[PDB]
Amino acid sequence: VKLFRASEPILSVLMWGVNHTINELSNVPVPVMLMPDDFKAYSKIKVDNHLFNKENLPSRFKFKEYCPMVFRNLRERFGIDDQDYQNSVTRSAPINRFLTTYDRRFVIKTVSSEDVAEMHNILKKYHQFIVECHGNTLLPQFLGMYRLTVDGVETYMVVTRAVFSHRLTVHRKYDLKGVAREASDKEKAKDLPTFKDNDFLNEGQKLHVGEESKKNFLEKLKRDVEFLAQLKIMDYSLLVGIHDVDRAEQFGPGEFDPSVDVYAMKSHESSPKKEVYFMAIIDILTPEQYSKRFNEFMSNILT
Amino acid sequence: KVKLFRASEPILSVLMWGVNHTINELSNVPVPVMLMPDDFKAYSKIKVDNHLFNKENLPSRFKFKEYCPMVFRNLRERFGIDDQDYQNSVTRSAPINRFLTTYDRRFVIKTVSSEDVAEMHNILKKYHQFIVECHGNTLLPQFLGMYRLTVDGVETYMVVTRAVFSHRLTVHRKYDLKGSTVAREASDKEKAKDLPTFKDNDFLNEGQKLHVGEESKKNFLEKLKRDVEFLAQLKIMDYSLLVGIHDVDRAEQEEMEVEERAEDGPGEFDPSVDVYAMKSHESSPKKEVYFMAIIDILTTVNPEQYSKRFNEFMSNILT
Ligand SMILES: Nc1nc2c(ncn2[C@@H]2O[C@H](COP(=O)(O)O)[C@@H](O)[C@H]2O)c(=O)[nH]1
Ligand SMILES: Nc1nc2c(ncn2[C@@H]2O[C@H](COP(=O)(O)O)[C@@H](O)[C@H]2O)c(=O)[nH]1
Ligand SMILES: Nc1nc2c(ncn2[C@@H]2O[C@H](COP(=O)(O)O)[C@@H](O)[C@H]2O)c(=O)[nH]1
């Protein structure tokens, strides 16, 4: 019995809409292939409830879903079950726009009109890419794209699989791009410090994962950025989280489900401090240069 | 469990889609202690524009409105009808035969007029209290839902009721009795249908009677007494007693014949489902089952008189 109780009507509508659309798709046969129109399709539903159901939801709102067939396919290829997705969004209000489902499994980012256009611009090539690499990638995993309309105001959203574990606490992150980029004094003091490539290399920090993972990671990181190039995109960073097992050891720690924390990596026997690294590409909605720059700076962290 | 909402017509798919949607949505709406006045003025509305998507059964574009959802959900409980049953009878397969039945013959679906929908609202408060204080014991139409559908910009109003006739037992002869002293009979046209809707004078000139037995006669005339007064307390006139007669032996042969036709219990029912049904007195000529209800209450004579007249006719119809 979902109330869609949220700190904000936009959120409730989001819960309502994700619920509605996922349900609706369950009466829609999974097809043998996606079609060209699927990339131009959408669903729109306008609600107008006079004097009814007003406790959590607005009375009047719109909810549009972009390319529901493509994104539903994307979910499967990413090994995400629609009813899990749905339950993550609808069972409890997402939290802190940049949100996560209450179970830290999915991220919900507000985006712009042009973001949504760029998404449409690259979606067929990105689907084709997901297919070809069998969903094995460091790229953002796009699960859904929506436009909510509440009080006349349109709001765009994009849902990705979270980068950081939904369980194992991160203790240090690093937004990396491969100029001058450090952490500002106005940020350097906070529960979660978001670093950058300068404060990293100068910090003599490395990620010890074994040559066996360097092989998977790089062999992926290469085809991924090569793909972003051919799409003539740039400014994408490499989000990197560290989880020192001890700091939290203070059921087991360092324990995680690779099928859920898809971005996680164990350190190697032949390594110093014992930790879990979370690594993926972020911010891809916007040269062969940026690519090879990126690739190089990131190869150097993997020993 | 895929519901395609496949139907011989867009309108029907939309109906299936709408009843499905509204019932699920209600399922997330807690059950109220009491109804509030606003609940009688309330409605839900949804408009769908699906572009290049989900077009194989549903239209791409449509509207679905439900009137006073809270009140009809309650009317449903008060008639011992479960929402999920209702939803399933409407959605599991297309309604069939502006009169429709659900694929399983439990519920009737009338296409009504804007006028009719309008009269529903007038009487909706007073109707609900009536059902409350008769605990659901009435020969009156039992209203389960009212909706407006929009397909191709065209608006169709529907009212859902419980079916008067048994979902199982075949009807072999039906009547529409009023009592009006004008001439009511069956046209030579109707007369030559399969199941002619016979009228007052036919029932009389046929000398028909229904042998229900006294315990049953009293309870029926008591329902009817309070039912037709309530109607009179409103402007309401010209409504009817729908009378179905089921012949148990005749059905038993018909069944027998249907088995040998394909290859190449009898007389009983659930009074919690077939709510209008009555068994014939064990001292009856033929073994029969009757179905008796009031119908058409929405759309030199007057209400109070009609009630007294209608009541007196029906009471002289049974023994
Ligand atoms: N009394 C009453 N009539 C209504 C109400 N809502 C709609 N109606 C009537 O029902 C019919 C259909 O209205 P619609 O829903 O298409 O606007 C019209 O006769 C309209 O005036 C209501 O809340 N109260
Ligand atoms: N759409 C709508 N129609 C109404 C409403 N209330 C009354 N009506 C319409 O306007 C008329 C008013 O009649 P009354 O309220 O005096 O019985 C009714 O015939 C009905 O069709 C309402 O709240 N909404
Ligand atoms: N009343 C009655 N009629 C029967 C019975 N068996 C057959 N008939 C009727 O006799 C005719 C021929 O029956 P058939 O054996 O060809 O089904 C049909 O009109 C059929 O309905 C029966 O047991 N009772």
UniProtKB/Swiss-Prot annotation, chain A:
Molecular function GO terms recorded: 1-phosphatidylinositol-4-phosphate 5-kinase activity; 1-phosphatidylinositol-5-phosphate 4-kinase activity; ATP binding; GTP binding; protein homodimerization activity
Q: Return the EC number.
A: 2.7.1.149
Concerning PROSITE patterns, the annotation shows: PIPK
Query: In which tissues has expression of this protein been reported?
Result: Highly expressed in brain, heart, pancreas, skeletal muscle and kidney. Detected at lower levels in placenta, lung and liver.
Give TM regions. none
Required for interaction with PIP5K1A: where is this region?
A: 32-38
Do you know which InterPro entries this protein is assigned to? PInositol-4-P-4/5-kinase_C_sf (IPR027483), PInositol-4-P-4/5-kinase_core (IPR002498), PInositol-4-P-5-kinase_N (IPR027484), PInositol-4/5-P-5/4-kinase (IPR023610)
* Positions where N6-acetyllysine occurs in the chain: 62, 109
Q: Where does GTP bind?
A: 162-163, 173, 283
- Keywords from the UniProt entry: Acetylation, ATP-binding, Cell membrane, Cytoplasm, Endoplasmic reticulum, GTP-binding, Kinase, Lipid metabolism, Membrane, Nucleotide-binding, Nucleus, Phosphoprotein, Transferase, Ubl conjugation
Q: Does the keyword Zinc apply?
A: no
Q: Which reaction does it catalyse?
A: a 1,2-diacyl-sn-glycero-3-phospho-(1D-myo-inositol-5-phosphate) + ATP = a 1,2-diacyl-sn-glycero-3-phospho-(1D-myo-inositol-4,5-bisphosphate) + ADP + H(+); 1,2-dihexadecanoyl-sn-glycero-3-phospho-(1D-myo-inositol-5-phosphate) + ATP = 1,2-dihexadecanoyl-sn-glycero-3-phospho-(1D-myo-inositol-4,5-bisphosphate) + ADP + H(+); 1,2-dihexadecanoyl-sn-glycero-3-phospho-(1D-myo-inositol-5-phosphate) + GTP = 1,2-dihexadecanoyl-sn-glycero-3-phospho-(1D-myo-inositol-4,5-bisphosphate) + GDP + H(+)
| Role, per record | Participates in the biosynthesis of phosphatidylinositol 4,5-bisphosphate. Preferentially utilizes GTP, rather than ATP, for PI(5)P phosphorylation and its activity reflects changes in direct proportion to the physiological GTP concentration. Its GTP-sensing activity is critical for metabolic adaptation. PIP4Ks negatively regulate insulin signaling through a catalytic-independent mechanism. They interact with PIP5Ks and suppress PIP5K-mediated PtdIns(4,5)P2 synthesis and insulin-dependent conversion to PtdIns(3,4,5)P3.
- The name this protein carries in UniProt is Phosphatidylinositol 5-phosphate 4-kinase type-2 beta
